Amino acid sequence: ARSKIALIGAGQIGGTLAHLAGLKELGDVVLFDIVDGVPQGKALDIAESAPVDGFDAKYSGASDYSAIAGADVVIVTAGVPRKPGMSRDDLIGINLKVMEAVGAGIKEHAPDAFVICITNPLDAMVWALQKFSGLPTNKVVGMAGVLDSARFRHFLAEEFGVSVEDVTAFVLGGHGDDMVPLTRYSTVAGVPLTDLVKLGWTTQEKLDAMVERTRKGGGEIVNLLKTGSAFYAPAASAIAMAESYLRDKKRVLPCAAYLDGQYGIDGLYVGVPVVIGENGVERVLEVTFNDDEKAMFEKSVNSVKGLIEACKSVNDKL
Amino acid sequence: ARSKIALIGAGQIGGTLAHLAGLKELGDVVLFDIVDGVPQGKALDIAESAPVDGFDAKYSGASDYSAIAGADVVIVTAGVPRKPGMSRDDLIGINLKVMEAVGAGIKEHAPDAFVICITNPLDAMVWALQKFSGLPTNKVVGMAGVLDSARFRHFLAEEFGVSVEDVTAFVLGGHGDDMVPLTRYSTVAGVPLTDLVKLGWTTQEKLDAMVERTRKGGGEIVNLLKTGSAFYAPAASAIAMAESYLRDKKRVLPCAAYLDGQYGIDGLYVGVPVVIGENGVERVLEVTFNDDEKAMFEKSVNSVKGLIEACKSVNDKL
Amino acid sequence: ARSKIALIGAGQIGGTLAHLAGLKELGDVVLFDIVDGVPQGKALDIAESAPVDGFDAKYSGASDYSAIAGADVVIVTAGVPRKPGMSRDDLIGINLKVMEAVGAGIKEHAPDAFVICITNPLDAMVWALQKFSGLPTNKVVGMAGVLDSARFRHFLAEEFGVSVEDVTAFVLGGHGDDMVPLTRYSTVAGVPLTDLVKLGWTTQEKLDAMVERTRKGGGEIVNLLKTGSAFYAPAASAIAMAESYLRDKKRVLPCAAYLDGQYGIDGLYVGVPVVIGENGVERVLEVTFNDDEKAMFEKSVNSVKGLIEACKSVNDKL
Amino acid sequence: ARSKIALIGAGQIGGTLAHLAGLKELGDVVLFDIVDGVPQGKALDIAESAPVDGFDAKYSGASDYSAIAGADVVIVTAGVPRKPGMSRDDLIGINLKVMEAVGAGIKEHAPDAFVICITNPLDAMVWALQKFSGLPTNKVVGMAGVLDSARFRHFLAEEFGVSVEDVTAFVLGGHGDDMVPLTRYSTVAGVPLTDLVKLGWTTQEKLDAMVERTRKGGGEIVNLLKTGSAFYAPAASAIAMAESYLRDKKRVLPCAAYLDGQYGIDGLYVGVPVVIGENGVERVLEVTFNDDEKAMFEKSVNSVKGLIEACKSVNDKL
Ligand SMILES: Nc1ncnc2c1ncn2[C@@H]1O[C@H](COP(=O)(O)OP(=O)(O)OC[C@H]2O[C@@H](O)[C@H](O)[C@@H]2O)[C@@H](O)[C@H]1O
Ligand SMILES: Nc1ncnc2c1ncn2[C@@H]1O[C@H](COP(=O)(O)OP(=O)(O)OC[C@H]2O[C@@H](O)[C@H](O)[C@@H]2O)[C@@H](O)[C@H]1O
Ligand SMILES: Nc1ncnc2c1ncn2[C@@H]1O[C@H](COP(=O)(O)OP(=O)(O)OC[C@H]2O[C@@H](O)[C@H](O)[C@@H]2O)[C@@H](O)[C@H]1O
Ligand SMILES: Nc1ncnc2c1ncn2[C@@H]1O[C@H](COP(=O)(O)OP(=O)(O)OC[C@H]2O[C@@H](O)[C@H](O)[C@@H]2O)[C@@H](O)[C@H]1O
Ligand SMILES: O=C([O-])CC(=O)C(=O)O
Ligand SMILES: O=C([O-])CC(=O)C(=O)O
Ligand SMILES: O=C([O-])CC(=O)C(=O)O
Ligand SMILES: O=C([O-])CC(=O)C(=O)O
Ligand SMILES: [Ca+2]
Ligand SMILES: [Ca+2]
Ligand SMILES: [Ca+2]
Ligand SMILES: [Ca+2]
Ligand SMILES: [Ca+2]
Ligand SMILES: [Ca+2]
Ligand SMILES: [Ca+2]
Ligand SMILES: [Ca+2]
Known part of the structure; x- marks a missing residue:
């Protein structure tokens, strides 16, 4: 049992x-x-x-x-x-x-x-x-996305000199160079990063650098270790998804989830915020994008489609 | 040691x-x-x-x-x-x-x-x-404020059917009928409550009811218990503040803090977001209010001044 | 679920x-x-x-x-x-x-x-x-018995100036004045208390005093509080039994368990060491007593029978 | 801080x-x-x-x-x-x-x-x-010794079908083929293993096999992994020693400690039970051995002396 x-x-x-x-x-x-x-x-x-x-x-x-x-x-x-x-x-x-x-x-x-x-x-x-x-x-x-988001949260916690518990990040799209961190939906204690730039808690340029460091995070760890890639943060991230299922926590986590119409996409896995409980992926949180976010997301998704065509390109069954 | x-x-x-x-x-x-x-x-x-x-x-x-x-x-x-x-x-x-x-x-x-x-x-x-x-x-x-905010988080977690870990609330002002929950700076996974109303994850009226239930939360517990007031959530809340100090966590928490100029106030304790570490209250996060939030906050602060005058009214030393 | x-x-x-x-x-x-x-x-x-x-x-x-x-x-x-x-x-x-x-x-x-x-x-x-x-x-x-044993463990940890994690106590019988702490089967890191007296880590008289303080522990807490009896340690104790069931831990804990022949007793609940897992009380650990331990246990059990006759004495169904 | x-x-x-x-x-x-x-x-x-x-x-x-x-x-x-x-x-x-x-x-x-x-x-x-x-x-x-003891505890928990929390092991001497597990001072819930053999909860032969498996445990893991040796249990073990120091827990743990006269030995590190708190190794628990335990311990210590002479044999300063 x-x-x-x-x-x-x-x-x-x-x-x-x-x-x-x-x-x-x-x-x-x-x-x-x-x-x-x-x-x-x-x-x-x-x-x-x-x-x-x-x-x-x-x-x-x-x-x-x-x-x-x-x-x-x-x-x-x-x-x-x-x-x-x-x-x-x-x-x-x-x-x-x-x-x-x-x-x-x-x-x-x-x-x-x-x-x-x-x-x-x-x-x-x-x-x-x-x-x-x-x-x-x-x-x-x-x-x-939980990994990507956790990297961003680390960099942000460092930047603002606050607890990792009180930082939030929203990163969607491919697990790729073109993943999309949403600065507008990332926060310290509920205050969006875009508002923190205004308050002078950080700068636009520092914020942009942290978005980029997030996009390149996996590579940064590969280049340091040399014999392999990251494993502590990937493992922690998957474990949080597993616990949400096993304990029916209904965590809201960015994960690569199967879309049937959400975000205007059908038939692919793409990184989006999802509720995870005892029935699996229970709901997708579909946010409203501004034009720049929408552009970045469409591109991220195009990469994913690129890769899926490459998989079919090389395998009968798919 | x-x-x-x-x-x-x-x-x-x-x-x-x-x-x-x-x-x-x-x-x-x-x-x-x-x-x-x-x-x-x-x-x-x-x-x-x-x-x-x-x-x-x-x-x-x-x-x-x-x-x-x-x-x-x-x-x-x-x-x-x-x-x-x-x-x-x-x-x-x-x-x-x-x-x-x-x-x-x-x-x-x-x-x-x-x-x-x-x-x-x-x-x-x-x-x-x-x-x-x-x-x-x-x-x-x-x-x-950590108590008030935790009540609001509970009610919100219930409403949206999500983990309490992924809900954020920002409640400032007096610990009073007129405390100020900031719906704009409260979130599910980084998405503000005002955006969730738009997405249809809840309604304005349900949101307003939860703000009110938060304001009356202490009383709700007094009326149930009859022989006393809340103690589990107050205790948990203070303990989180204590741990942040003892472990130098730099949590960002809404607490009644001494203001010297922040939020345009000097010489009072008022509920605001503060960073707590090994040096005590290390920083106050001063957000920019819209006109309604500013009105609610000025009122909350006036109650606090009312109470302080009552304390002087009855004690020489103060 | x-x-x-x-x-x-x-x-x-x-x-x-x-x-x-x-x-x-x-x-x-x-x-x-x-x-x-x-x-x-x-x-x-x-x-x-x-x-x-x-x-x-x-x-x-x-x-x-x-x-x-x-x-x-x-x-x-x-x-x-x-x-x-x-x-x-x-x-x-x-x-x-x-x-x-x-x-x-x-x-x-x-x-x-x-x-x-x-x-x-x-x-x-x-x-x-x-x-x-x-x-x-x-x-x-x-x-x-988990409560009684935890009191004894506290007193022992204090006496020897060691972690509560490395102290063990075995207390059987009634939850009563005549419960039986078994000094021979209580330990610091595996070394029996009877051996620790020999090594000079404590004295016989101090050991006897701690056995007695354990027997009177509930009363000691009643006399301090005045308005009620102990609740933190009783609660912790029951929770450990509950967790062992829910997580199938197979903890070995002294609990009041139904005996059909173990310890030569049939048809009563008496405090004995039991394995608790997903099937409930899964096994009783029946130790071999020396003559003094056997005498104390027979007496403890007689009190329990006394009380059971009193319950029948006052209720038809039983 | x-x-x-x-x-x-x-x-x-x-x-x-x-x-x-x-x-x-x-x-x-x-x-x-x-x-x-x-x-x-x-x-x-x-x-x-x-x-x-x-x-x-x-x-x-x-x-x-x-x-x-x-x-x-x-x-x-x-x-x-x-x-x-x-x-x-x-x-x-x-x-x-x-x-x-x-x-x-x-x-x-x-x-x-x-x-x-x-x-x-x-x-x-x-x-x-x-x-x-x-x-x-x-x-x-x-x-x-904490590693060796934890291996023995695992094997014992498996054998008796009980929680790892309620098993104790005492392993002294070299971290070597000749380390000394003390079956008499290892327990399930306070009951020595030697008593459990008597009660029929296990056999002498199974007990001897587990003592041997403990002695060979490091090798067993090397032979499985092939590219290296154990790391999860060694790490956990050292961390428990570290926590006892940092939190002044006064855990009683078998560790390689410097002896000045305890166990009749002066000037060597040997695995013995020690109390670890804020002042480091605070006390050595010196148990009384029977003749077989004493023989095994003297031998273990002789290996350690062998190795120390080999270190001097190859280095001026030592
Ligand atoms: N067909 C197979 N079936 C089962 N296991 C396999 C197979 N092929 C390889 N393995 C095992 O998968 C394991 C992969 O482990 P690592 O090489 O250590 O890689 P890790 O860092 O664990 O990354 C695993 C995967 O996750 C991604 O983050 C990463 O890009 C990689 O695709 C190895 O132990 C390997 O033996
Ligand atoms: N001068 C005093 N010095 C020390 N302790 C005192 C004093 N006066 C009263 N006490 C003790 O303060 C304690 C208050 O405990 P509770 O009455 O149980 O009240 P609690 O629910 O613990 O609330 C304590 C306080 O926190 C607020 O949330 C609440 O409004 C109240 O002001 C009591 O044990 C009481 O004996
Ligand atoms: N018939 C009943 N049905 C349900 N609940 C009841 C009933 N009769 C009393 N209660 C409730 O049982 C509760 C007992 O709580 P406390 O009086 O606070 O006693 P506590 O210290 O919790 O002890 C409970 C029990 O455990 C033993 O340790 C102790 O000797 C007592 O028998 C009370 O809230 C009371 O209203
Ligand atoms: N002079 C040195 N200074 C600092 N680090 C060193 C040095 N020499 C080697 N290292 C590093 O020590 C590390 C040892 O790690 P692993 O080879 O992975 O070995 P591990 O399984 O970690 O075992 C470490 C040690 O503990 C014992 O259990 C084991 O027998 C070994 O002696 C390596 O990263 C290596 O680069
Ligand atoms: O990037 C990789 O190779 C492994 C991984 O998924 C990450 O670190 O982000
Ligand atoms: O309201 C009270 O009386 C106690 C308290 O601070 C709370 O519950 O909010
Ligand atoms: O003794 C009591 O009244 C309550 C109890 O069970 C204990 O404290 O041991
Ligand atoms: O044996 C080794 O090589 C590493 C170690 O200390 C252990 O596993 O016991
Ligand atoms: Ca924490
Ligand atoms: Ca849609
Ligand atoms: Ca958690
Ligand atoms: Ca200002
Ligand atoms: Ca612990
Ligand atoms: Ca029998
Ligand atoms: Ca545990
Ligand atoms: Ca000696």
Whole structure:
């Protein structure tokens, strides 16, 4: 009767997800990977940490999909990350094929799961995984905007010298160079950033620099680490989406969600604000854009369509 | 070397403060009261709960002010609460005299404390306590707006069917019938309430009703309980202010703060958004009002001045 | 789909239970009482605190038993507490009649609940409540030994100057003057207290005094407070039992449990170590006593039988 | 005024330490490493995660020791880990030289720190680091026994089907093949394992197998992962030691501590139960052994002396 969380991919993000699921006592955890030994190892290491922190959760590792049977939530990091110099879209060839296998494992063994996709390029990969798996669209989502928004919140907290708890950010669109941070709908304690520029708490130029740093955030971390990409903030972000589902919190979070008409878009995953509860993606919050925001969003969406055509370009079934 | 928190008043709020200080592992706790036995009892009861939850904190009870020596934070609930039918301003006669004694105990034994006043009527009582005690104005604050704002957040979370974590409220002014909730600076995930009315997520009339329910919130709880007033949400609210100080979080919180020129006011405590860190009230966020907000705020402040004149009206020293 | 916790009695312990259930995010809460207004008030006050701490839980108050429908856990504090000068057994007359009504409300509206009884005198009241309600015996338990054990742990932590996290206590029998703390099965970091006396970390006489202080602990708190009895540690204790059920933790806790043969006893509730998980009381840990421990336990059990005969003495159905 | 934690080594354990220090809100964090980019990257990634979980902590990365200035706690993982086939003692050549540099950085820039050493082989490395650094012996400790004990607790929790919170383990000696788990001082809820065998809750043979699995635990994880050694449980373990210091918890934990006469040993670090508070290692709990335990402990200590002679064998200063 505890919730069961299956982690497909037991790498950098996958391990961090497992550790956090325990610390937050979200349920039992299964780590799945094709490299044998790795998920069993990480599973046992985290299990062995549990008595120090006092959390009760069962941990196991597997390389067979039957291990995921009946999972309440499935989080997918399987595939490859970027190296310095690469865009996320350079990962499609390898990663699309991974989503195909993963999707078949979910369809067969955890068809009632809430599935959170992280593998990049995210808006394309999650669209793919939903098709391959055949799960209902409200039960399949992509983690991106919560990460982007959390980066922006960090930079803003630093700039204004305030608690991260009292900063809000709204970032929509692709998880891409062209994602759209909405300065008008980002706040300190409810006061929009555009108002804070007026009050002199910051400048326009500093605000623009933070928007740009947000757009380039993933790359900034790749360039520092060199051997891989970010994993702490991606993991935290997906975990918040998972907790909202498992605890029916109805968090409002920017996630790559399937649109049927919202924002005038039909049939794609795109980053938008969504309510997440026990029924999955329960509602999309459709804001009214001004002309500049609308332009940036249309462009972001065009990139996503570009990527989706590239996925079809290379795979029969899609 | 652990932080020491002194709780002046060991009643309904006082006990709840103590319990929360332990659960959040904020430090050692001293409960102070004039009714002997009560603070010792509550102290020992909470101490005895600690092994169940795993928090290490020393707890003691006293009716001598020397017990508070060297406290890092002092939270004052001493005095009397309302009964059904009373306004908060009916409490001045009794409560002003309490602040006089409390202020003298702080001045003598915990002069370097960060002091959070809760005793009502709050904007008057905290102004009094700061004068009686002589502590620097940035080290003395009133808990009110965080409570008011949290009520509004609850009502809003209910209305929109979203997580309390993703709702923001901005309530300024007196802790009074005329406090000012700013619908324009209250949000769901960064989207102002005024925009949500437009989007049809709620109505103007429902929004107005929630503003009113917020203004009358304290009374609503008095009328239900009958034997006393609210204590869980007041306690939680003060504890968040205390934690921001002790952990240097720089939370942005609406609190009754001493103004020297901000909002065009000099020499009063009034509810405004303030940054709280290791140096106390570190900054006041002065927003730009429209004409209606400015009118409501001027009125709220006039009530506060009314009450302050009533305190002088009845006490030589002030 | 969140768990639902019904709190029967919305007094001192009842309110504290509600507050803790939220803070630990255990589920939705219903407070039930016969004094109208009180459970609605406390419910709304805690609901209003929630945005400060970030927990999502629905709170309501009621005086009709239909409100408890479908509760996963029910915690019963309804009845009356002691005043200075009284034993717990002086509460039977009033409290037995309360258990009768409560039992009928559970039988009708939450027959699949895990029920934790707190109302005193506890070993008698829980035996009663199980009969009146007709629920399976593994789904009905009494909170006592966790409280007694936590008091002992506090006193021990103080004595040895160590963390409460690293102290263990084993207290069996009645929740009464004659409860049995087992010094041999109480420890600091795994080292029995009897060994610590030998090592000189404490003395026999200090150890005996702490055993006695534990036996008299409830009274010590009554005498301090004067208007009522302990509520923080009782509430924490029951909450740990509830969490073990709801999260299937399989905590090993001393609770008043129904015995069918364990410890050579059949047909009574007595304080023993039990494993609590998703199926209720899952196992009883039956330790081997030495002659002194066996004598103390037989006596404790005789008191419990005394009290049960007194309950039959005054009620047809039992 | 927040506590400052310096992490010397920003690898697998180092990163995990940083993440946990934030989640537990222990203070500001500096990650230090010789590979440039790595500590800056991990620091920024964790900083960027913070708004998701609500913790306020400053994070930075450095490859200059001046960055550690004034740290309250320093945790050292710098050096190299094992690959499959190696013992921990095969790491001395490289790691001793690392401790020399680290020790000089601490001596110069954080001489008032509480220093927790993790780098293997641990009992030798921490003895070295204390000499190189010259800090007082009560301010320098090795993390090992908490890890070993937590592995044993996991295996035991599994075996008995009980919560990890209610299992205790006592493991002394070297962090080595010959560490000494004390079955007599390990417990479920206060009942020794030797008593549980008698009660039939487990068998002698299963107990012996779990003792052995504990002794080989590090290797078991190396063999699974292949590219490195355990990091989640080592990190959790050190963090508990750090928290006990920073919050003056007085946890009783088995750690590699400097002995002056305890256990009849003078001048070495060996794994023993110690009280950790604001003054560092405050007390050693010296238990009385039976003849078998004494034999195992003397042997464990002889290995440690072996390793210390090997360190002198290869370095002038020691
Ligand atoms: N077909 C597969 N099935 C299951 N697991 C797989 C498969 N192919 C690869 N894996 C595993 O997926 C894991 C990916 O882990 P990392 O390489 O450490 O990458 P991480 O940093 O965890 O990123 C994972 C994904 O998330 C995105 O942020 C990133 O761009 C990448 O696409 C590896 O352990 C790898 O063995
Ligand atoms: N001079 C005094 N010094 C110290 N303590 C005092 C004094 N006078 C009264 N007290 C104590 O102050 C405590 C107040 O507790 P409660 O009556 O339970 O009131 P509570 O609900 O805790 O409200 C406290 C205060 O906060 C406001 O919200 C409310 O309007 C009231 O002013 C009581 O225990 C009372 O003995
Ligand atoms: N028949 C009833 N049905 C429902 N609720 C009832 C009934 N009779 C009384 N109550 C309520 O039970 C509540 C008991 O609360 P408190 O009097 O504050 O007592 P508390 O300290 O909460 O103790 C409760 C119980 O637990 C034991 O520790 C103690 O000895 C007492 O038996 C009160 O709010 C009271 O209105
Ligand atoms: N002289 C040095 N100064 C600072 N950092 C160093 C130095 N030499 C190596 N490092 C860094 O120490 C870090 C060690 O990290 P990992 O190799 O990932 O090893 P980890 O699993 O973190 O183990 C660290 C240590 O703890 C023990 O458990 C283990 O046996 C090893 O000795 C690496 O990032 C490495 O760059
Ligand atoms: O950018 C990447 O390669 C990984 C990722 O999704 C992020 O860091 O934003
Ligand atoms: O209103 C009162 O009497 C107590 C209080 O400050 C509140 O509930 O808002
Ligand atoms: O003793 C009482 O009256 C209440 C109780 O159960 C305790 O404090 O032990
Ligand atoms: O064994 C190792 O190499 C690392 C370590 O200290 C452990 O896992 O016990
Ligand atoms: Ca726990
Ligand atoms: Ca539309
Ligand atoms: Ca703890
Ligand atoms: Ca101004
Ligand atoms: Ca939360
Ligand atoms: Ca038997
Ligand atoms: Ca927080
Ligand atoms: Ca000795």
